[PDB]
Design a protein around this ligand. Structure first.
Ligand SMILES: CCC(=O)N[C@H]1[C@H]([C@H](O)[C@H](O)CO)O[C@@](OCc2ccccc2)(C(=O)O)C[C@@H]1O
Length: 119
């Protein structure tokens, strides 16, 4: 069954780090020969910036370069996103997408809202 489970809200402090827990799923009969591509988006419906791209890392916006890293193992169906050196501007929406093959790709429209404060 196709899906992405991650928190609706997550809070963090400026200069610290934060973890957005995440897990995904898909049907048992979906073939997976050459792994799964993992992608995280920031403000998808607006600026649409790439935070993580396990398939084409040069697509990662300079804004997040060196500051975001995917924790979980795709093999274990985990998509946890760790964000480092937080900035108030990091506040906004984050959505995960995984792409296996052909039409077997999925963007979670729910996403997680991030709130970074100074103190
Ligand atoms: C078999 C699983 C599945 O339904 N995957 C579809 C996904 C999926 O429905 C969404 O990602 C779930 O949120 O949508 C897609 O188009 C997205 C699209 C739809 C309409 C217009 C433009 C683009 C997508 O690539 O995200 C096409 C996929 O085939």
């Amino acid at each position: 069954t196709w899906g992405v489970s991650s928190p609706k809200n997550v809070q963090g402090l400026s200069g610290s780090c934060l973890l957005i827990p995440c897990i995904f799923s898909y049907p048992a009969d979906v073939p997976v020969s050459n792994g799964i591509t993992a992608i995280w988006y920031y403000d998808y419906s607006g600026k649409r910036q790439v935070v993580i791209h396990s398939g084409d890392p040069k697509l990662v916006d300079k804004r997040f370069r060196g500051r975001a890293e995917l924790m979980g193992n795709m093999d274990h169906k985990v998509c946890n996103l760790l964000l480092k050196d937080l900035k108030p501007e990091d506040s906004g929406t984050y959505n995960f997408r995984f792409e296996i093959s052909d039409s077997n790709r999925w963007l979670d429209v729910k996403g997680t809202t991030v709130t970074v404060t100074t103190d």
